[PDB]
Amino acid sequence: LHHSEKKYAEEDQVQELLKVLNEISKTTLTLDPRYIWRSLKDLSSLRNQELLNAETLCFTVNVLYPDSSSFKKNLLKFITSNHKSSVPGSAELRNSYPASFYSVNTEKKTIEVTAEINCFMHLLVQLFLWDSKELEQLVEFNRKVVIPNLLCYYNLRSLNLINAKLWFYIYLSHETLARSSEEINSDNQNIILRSTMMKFLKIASLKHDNETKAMLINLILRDFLNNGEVDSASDFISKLEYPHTDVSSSLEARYFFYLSKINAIQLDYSTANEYIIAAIRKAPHNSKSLGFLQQSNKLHCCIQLLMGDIPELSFFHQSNMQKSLLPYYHLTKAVKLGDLKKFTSTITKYKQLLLKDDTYQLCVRLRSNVIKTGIRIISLTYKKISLRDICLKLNLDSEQTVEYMVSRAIRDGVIEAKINHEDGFIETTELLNIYDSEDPQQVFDERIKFANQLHDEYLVSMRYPEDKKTQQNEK
Amino acid sequence: NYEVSEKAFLLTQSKVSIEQRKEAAEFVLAKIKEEEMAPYYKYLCEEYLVNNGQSDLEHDEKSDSLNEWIKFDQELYNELCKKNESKIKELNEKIQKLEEDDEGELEQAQAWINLGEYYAQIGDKDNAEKTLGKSLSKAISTGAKIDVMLTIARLGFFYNDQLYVKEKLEAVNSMIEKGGDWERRNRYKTYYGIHCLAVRNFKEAAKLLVDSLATFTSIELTSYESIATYASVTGLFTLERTDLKSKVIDSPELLSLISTTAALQSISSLTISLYASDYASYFPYLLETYANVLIPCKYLNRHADFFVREMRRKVYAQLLESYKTLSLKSMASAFGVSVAFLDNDLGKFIPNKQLNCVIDRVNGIVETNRPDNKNAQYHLLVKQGDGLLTKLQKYGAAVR
């Protein structure tokens, strides 16, 4: 029963291993093994549930174990394993073949097979752990082993993509352990984790690997947000080491998602408004990407309210995600109408929902945006309006309070008006008629630049996928 | 079946003239008993859930209707199933003779045509659409193909189907060659005009409703006074003052409606007050029309008060171009408008750039801004140009 179960899944694993083994042996091809590893995550996740855990036991017995003898026993100890007589030395799939990792030349140490075998061995370990959701000692045991192993290897061009997906599980398993239980050792463990990310990122700068630095920057920028150091994130993004060429669309959307949150506290919403929009277009619309589109759209609605301009309300009702957008619907209504008591009562009941995403602190500063937007609305109504009539519509305190708020927004060019005290009304200084000025000409220049940029980007990849058609013999 | 859907909607939510619910409830009870539809007597329970003026009294004592019992029972249900099983026995007896004969493609399709009418009159929706697809492929010409669309449009107007009905609507239109066919024109312009209602297109609504071939009046779906009802409502948006004195006021089809149906009054009180641009007479006719037109109609009351905001926007633009500087108290004693409530009425437009009115709060006078310029027109190209570049970058990066 259990004998035929281990031979079926192991044969499917070796079949996928021999495909990427011959591709890296001849010259250097990094494109083909990368496309297979994309589907490997989905095929292995479903396969780990079937045929239990016994598919990975004979794989370690097959190939030679540099470090991997005692690591599988520690993984099988937590599950209280019953003895099936799985002791190594029973099943032998090598049988002295060149593609089978010939044993005599391997045992004599005349050839080194450990490079591709050991780096691939650590990949299947983190996949089974993420399926069973194992924590505590098993998480710390892997972090201690992997770090010296990556420092010993020279990390060639093909070797940089093997551990590129392993760093994601290092930071993921550390955050799930802290949120599950808080202790004194969780803080000291994060100190070493910060130094490990920076040492490997600096080494990857010489190799100039596109996917390696893409996964690290996404994990490092998120670490600064949890640890709460802004000065580290400000200088980190100033170097601009993130390549835009071969990185995946899923990795690009995560990059622009962090820049919108960093610039949110810098009081510059001009550049932050573009990063949150570009992150939506780069993120897929599929079901697995719904988790990112849910959090990204919650930030976009908050940025527009911080800009003093009411965004388009059609995004809430037309989308199918409005169930989670209900708290943000009443926030825009309170800022637009300018009701003072409605805004205070909205953030009070929904404070629990806004605590998880940490957007409640930004809602505290929306209290100012309620009045600043209302002043902009009433200013665009009538060019000449009395001073005391403003306090009657918004139910303000006195005329001395509104006098400062109108002259406050004109510093950034918001209201664009003047207050006449001797006359008794506030006259708007905006006559429009910009058709005679040069201001629209500056915007028209940047629009054509976007056209010539896409034309050059159209030339980036055109003939490239067709380059292999001429060299390969056709009919 | 126009009164079937009309009286059923009057029992949903009615805030004006609750006496109409009695004639509506007594009609739907006597209509279902005289027809073969089983489930439409049962649908009264689910369709009226969570609505003002509940027509059902079981656990909810807040029902304001005159007839408070729509409750479904097995006494009427069993009687309607007997008429359904007795009729299908006669049709299956004829269909069995047609299957053994199989004379031409018309008799083979007529078997499904009798079913397409049967499954539509027994209360089946998806089961009727499956029978209409068989008769569509067996039709010998376009004459039997459009009759399939008539049943599709019948079940689509009751359940508000904007997808399957709209797709089959343009399918009969395109086909191979359209031509000047009366059936593919008169019926299409009326039905497609009804689909433009719910989505509020207003571009084709004025052309396909205010302008009709003659009377329409199929009596099966919508009636004569209904087409003229939506014509007065939709004719106040796209049609400007040039067409109001031609296809509205001077239209010969609307001249005999005043002396025929006096319950509408949307082609006289609304048209004369707007053509004369008199706010004094135009104001009291808003609520009189809102009660007897927008509320009873199914495709109107869904929006309702939004139309009041849009219809009042038209008269504000008529007066704005008639003067530059005017006092606020001048229109108060003349057109009968409240000065204190005037700022709140105009406050829903001016900040949204819907109107150019500017009122001075010092001396209490209203001014006029520039109605049109080159700068305001280029702003539409900015939003249209930036919205277009999104698809170029989205579809450009998706294909690689």
């Binding site: 059609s314 009702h317 037309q318 | 104001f283 008060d305 939004f306 905001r309 409240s338 829903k348």
Partner: peptide, 27 residues
């Protein structure tokens, strides 16, 4: 639809008749 296409106003509905009443009384 959104903005004022749905919420509209929800105020001054039945109070429109009170505007003509106060004009014919306080006059």
């Amino acid at each position: 639809e959104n903005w004022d296409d749905v919420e509209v106003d929800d105020d001054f509905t039945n109070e429109l008749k009170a505007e003509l009443d106060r004009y014919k009384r306080e006059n």
